[PDB]
């Protein structure tokens, strides 16, 4: 129970911090980079919690993990939409495009690591194909918005 609770609370914290990031992009007056950093470190803390499994988990664990992973699928589109709104304002700030680009790239890597940690865990083998499928689709979307934002921001800059 406590291992599984730590895992799922960590995944819920990731979704909370992602909503906080999307809000900061849309409504923020830097503080934006802080929001990306906090999301990154929530992902890292989820990796740590997944890696702390040392003992088989109960038979309801893989379905609870699937439920906690489900909201992640909506993150790239929400972030993409917010970034499109603020693109021109971000491009106006010296080094703005490059700071967002660097954070988008890192955020994609930290999500992919967390997905892979779950997908490749022997304690989560019963959902390996589902988690791997979600991982790849997250990656595709996360890459497309990263490359789209970078190319459009450079030009508006």
Count Cβ atoms within 10 A of the Cβ of residue 30 and give its class: 0-12 exposed, 13-18 middle, 19 or more buried.
Answer: exposed
Q: Which residue lies nearer to Cl ion by CB, 4 or 157? A: 4
Task: Give min distance, CB of 7 to Cl ion, in A.
Answer: 8
Chain breaks in the chain (C to N over 2.5 A) after: 29
Task: Give min distance, CB of 73 to Cl ion, in A.
Answer: 19
Stretch in the footprint of Cl ion (CB under 5 A) among 1-9, 52-60, 94-102, 123-131 = 1-9
How far is Cα 74 from Cα 77, in angstroms, rounded to an integer? Answer: 6
Is 8 among the residues that bind Cl ion (CB under 5 A)? yes
Is 12 among the residues that bind Cl ion (CB under 5 A)? no
Stretch in the footprint of Cl ion (CB under 5 A) among 6-14, 27-35, 108-116, 132-140 = 6-14
Tokens 């304002």 belong to residue: 89
120 phi and psi angles, rounded to 5 deg: -100, 0
Q: Which residue lies nearer to Cl ion by CB, 67 or 129? A: 67
How far is Cα 53 from Cα 7, in angstroms, rounded to an integer? Answer: 9
Task: Give min distance, CB of 4 to Cl ion, in A.
Answer: 6
Applying CB under 5 A, which residues contact Cl ion?
Answer: 5, 8
């Amino acid at each position: 129970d406590d291992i599984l609770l730590a895992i799922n609370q960590s995944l819920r914290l990731v979704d909370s911090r992602a909503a906080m990031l999307v809000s900061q992009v849309r409504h923020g007056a830097g503080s934006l980079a802080d929001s990306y950093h906090e999301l990154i470190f929530s992902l890292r803390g989820a990796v740590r919690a997944v890696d702390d499994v040392w003992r088989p988990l109960p038979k309801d664990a893989p379905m609870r993990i699937v439920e906690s992973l489900r909201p992640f699928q909506k993150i790239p589109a929400s972030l993409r939409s917010a970034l499109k709104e603020r693109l021109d304002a971000i491009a106006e700030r010296p080094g703005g495009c490059q700071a967002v680009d660097d954070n988008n790239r890192q955020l994609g890597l930290d999500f992919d690591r967390l997905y892979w940690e779950i997908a490749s865990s022997s304690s989560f083998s019963a959902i390996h194909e589902t988690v791997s499928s979600q991982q790849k689709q997250f990656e595709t979307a996360m890459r497309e918005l990263t490359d789209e934002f970078s190319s459009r921001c450079l030009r508006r800059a």
